Write a protein that binds this ligand. Structure first.
Ligand SMILES: [Fe+3]
Length: 214
């Protein structure tokens, strides 16, 4: 976690690991330039913040929405770390086990959840993120302890709310997709879900989320 000599964390696969769906070129820019830059700038800004955790810096700098200078950088480092963990070579398909059950419990069906997640991703105007998060007051009316789809602008993530545990994200900043899809953000989102998403990753987060909100 902490901001010592913090370094950029590589994705959990080689930069060509997601070919042909997300290009090596996209990885090289998105991770090697954008993500790297957030890391470098955060380190320059980070001070009373020195040696604090990424998440602590994020929640404090959000400042109820009147954000402090380190917020954008800290939140984007975390968001991109999380984003790389959300995908895998040979990803896609459907979740299983408790994640699938909960998704069916809260959205009726996986397909309904998929459509809701894709619409959130598609309609976030400008730069930002779409999320699947576990909503639980014990994290911080009885509904409560359930999955939600949320879209957020710019660097904002569900950690700043809170009572939300992020489970899945898709980056909808144009740099995430422009080299591969240009304007076609819906096709990108669709392909992300069909081919890239690591349901194993999302399931692990859900276990952590349930443990934390018990
Ligand atoms: Fe990005």
């Amino acid at each position: 976690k902490v901001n010592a000599k913090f370094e950029l964390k590589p994705p959990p696969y080689p930069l060509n690991g997601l070919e042909p769906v997300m290009s090596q070129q996209t990885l090289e820019f998105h991770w090697g330039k954008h993500h790297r830059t957030y890391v470098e700038n955060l380190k320059k800004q980070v001070t009373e913040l020195d040696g604090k955790s990424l998440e602590e810096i994020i929640v404090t700098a959000y400042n109820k929405g009147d954000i402090l200078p380190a917020f954008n950088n800290a939140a984007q480092v975390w968001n991109h770390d999380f984003f790389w963990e959300c995908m895998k070579p040979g990803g896609g398909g459907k979740p299983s086990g408790e994640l699938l059950e909960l998704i069916e419990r809260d959205f009726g069906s996986f397909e309904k959840f998929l459509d809701e997640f894709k619409a959130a991703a598609a309609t976030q105007f400008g730069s930002g993120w779409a999320w699947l998060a576990y909503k639980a007051s014990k994290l911080d009316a009885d509904e409560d302890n359930k999955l939600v789809v949320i879209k957020s602008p710019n660097a904002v993530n569900p950690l700043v709310w809170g009572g939300y545990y992020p489970l899945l994200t898709i980056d909808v900043w144009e740099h995430a997709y422009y080299l591969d899809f240009q304007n076609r953000r819906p096709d990108y989102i669709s392909v992300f879900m069909d081919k890239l998403v690591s349901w194993d990753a999302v399931s692990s987060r859900l276990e952590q989320a349930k443990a934390l909100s018990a």
